[PDB]
Amino acid sequence: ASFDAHERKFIVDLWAKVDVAQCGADALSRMLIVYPWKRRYFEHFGKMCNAHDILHNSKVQEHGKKVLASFGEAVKHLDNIKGHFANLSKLHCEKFHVDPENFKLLGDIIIIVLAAHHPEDFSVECHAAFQKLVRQVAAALAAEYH
């Protein structure tokens, strides 16, 4: 659905407090540790044998910054999430070959990273507004899959 005014306030006020570089590095590292098959898609970033390797890989750290910066452009296009992400959907499908079920797993890991970094702000209703955003971004990244 459209975001209502209360959902928008939750998302905009919280995103302004997020350290995107730190949260993005954390989120990408956690997805490769928690879902180890995802390492296959990134096997050009180096060996990722274990959590120690992943946490000390500068390529993983820098890529996670770009991914969460990209995700954070949703916050400025809440009316047009599917259209904003259509090229990146195509790029994941055709160039990176990523299975679209994986987008939902990274959205669940971003919620956990946000919850841990902003516990007083991540109220029941704030969480519900962010669960709707990650569900829409994951859907937009799956949309140009043919």
């Binding site: 540790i33 919850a115 841990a116 516990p119 519900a128």
Partner: protein, 141 residues
Amino acid sequence: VLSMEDKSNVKAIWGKASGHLEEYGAEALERMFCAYPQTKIYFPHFDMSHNSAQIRAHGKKVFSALHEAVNHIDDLPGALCRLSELHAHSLRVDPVNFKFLAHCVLVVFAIHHPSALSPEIHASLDKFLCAVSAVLTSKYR
């Protein structure tokens, strides 16, 4: 399969919830009803207000069951046998719902114990909650 390291990780993080089973369980239910409103169809009889007596009482039963599962982590099929019959056969809960609650449990630990839920502990606790969910969806007939 949960390793020896996974089993120790799950015990360590679960010990933080000692003394808090009702509180953390109530919060995990409130987050599931709000973030995934489609789960409210299983609980038509519940007062869905914040800290309702029904939600606090139900939250405490859920976390108590998880606490017993942590203590019997080597035999989850035996520890959760009655609950698998209730959810799968009597309530016919759609299996997608166990993922929503497992996610809301992780969020409750991230909020109360952010440093304790490190990347390796997160991986172990996610493996435990999938294992619990797999026993609870094992008896559909």
